[PDB]
Design a binder for this molecule. Structure first.
Ligand code: NA
Lengths: 193, 183
């Protein structure tokens, strides 16, 4: 059993992260597991622990935060929501790739907690077409572009969401390429011997 | 700037077969790195297509003048990669695909680390001399960036295309493109 990879897809709000993540999971060639979040809220109708969420108490959640066992977390209306280190680690050690789609502020928490993850920045198609366009809106668009390029330096790869199908193909290519790195390939061959 | 893609692996692994299939693929944007040789053309071979056919005098002068990226002599015949052709195509934004023997690949690695080194792996490795070969192939592999099994030629081709596209999507390269656009 080769170690799984944590694949983190982020990028600005409205770039199509949700749509790309859905298409990645619909693709018959992918074999990712979705990251299951831990929450302190109680289950709703049809929800199962270990399937929809890891339902835990506030005490358990805060203890996980204090012990550095939380990759990312936030409190949304008195309820904690977060990505637990223990369950991500168990799946990676069992050889399963985990795919996590998250907002840019959440991604920086995950990056600090798990630098071994593969961080993909989903890019607006307008970023390359910026010059093919001073108004306060033009000044804002140029400022947005500069900050996206600066944010991108924290990521491993940047993929343009020109066509959802194209972003999916590039993401599959990234994950396959990461598994072909000789450090990982040698590990497989040595464990065989 | 174009990427230097170096495909290597042991003799008989199918480097030639995989390189031919890579160039037959309609999606390939790679330009084949044509080697220079002092041997005469074989049946169906053309200068500037299959090889740069040159005399020993020209080749030895290119060696002496530091104009070879890598070279070797095999039973009186020189084979090598001219440095200028590579450097010019890379600067013009063309990706270069170089299929070479393991000893040639290590010359290129020393000269140009920025290259993407792909080790084409025998399928029998996962399945006394055979064990010794396997151990040395695993040891060699550590000097390469990626290792691709030649299980099915079509599968090796898609993994190689995937490697080149992924290297193009690295944020260091993507940021460089966007900054130039910015000004
Ligand atoms: Na596809």
């Amino acid at each position: 059993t080769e170690r799984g990879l944590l694949i983190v897809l982020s990028g600005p709000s409205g770039v199509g992260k949700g749509t790309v993540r859905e298409a990645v999971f619909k693709d018959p060639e992918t074999s990712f597991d979705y990251s299951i979040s831990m929450t302190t809220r109680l289950p709703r109708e049809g929800e199962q622990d270990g399937v929809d969420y890891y339902f835990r108490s506030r005490e358990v959640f805060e203890q996980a935060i204090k012990d550095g066992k939380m990759l990312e977390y936030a409190e949304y209306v008195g309820n904690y929501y977060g990505t637990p280190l223990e369950y991500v680690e168990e799946k990676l050690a069992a050889g399963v790739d985990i795919f996590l789609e998250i907002e840019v502020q959440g991604a920086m928490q995950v990056r600090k907690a798990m630098p071994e993850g593969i961080f993909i920045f989903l890019t607006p198609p307008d970023l390359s077409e910026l010059k093919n366009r001073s108004m306060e809106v033009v000044e804002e668009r140029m400022e947005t572009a500069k900050k996206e390029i600066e944010m991108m330096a924290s990521y491993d790869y940047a993929v343009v969401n020109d066509v959802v199908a194209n972003a999916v193909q590039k993401i599959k290519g990234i994950v396959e390429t990461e598994h072909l790195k000789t450090e990982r390939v040698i590990h497989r061959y040595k464990k065989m011997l």
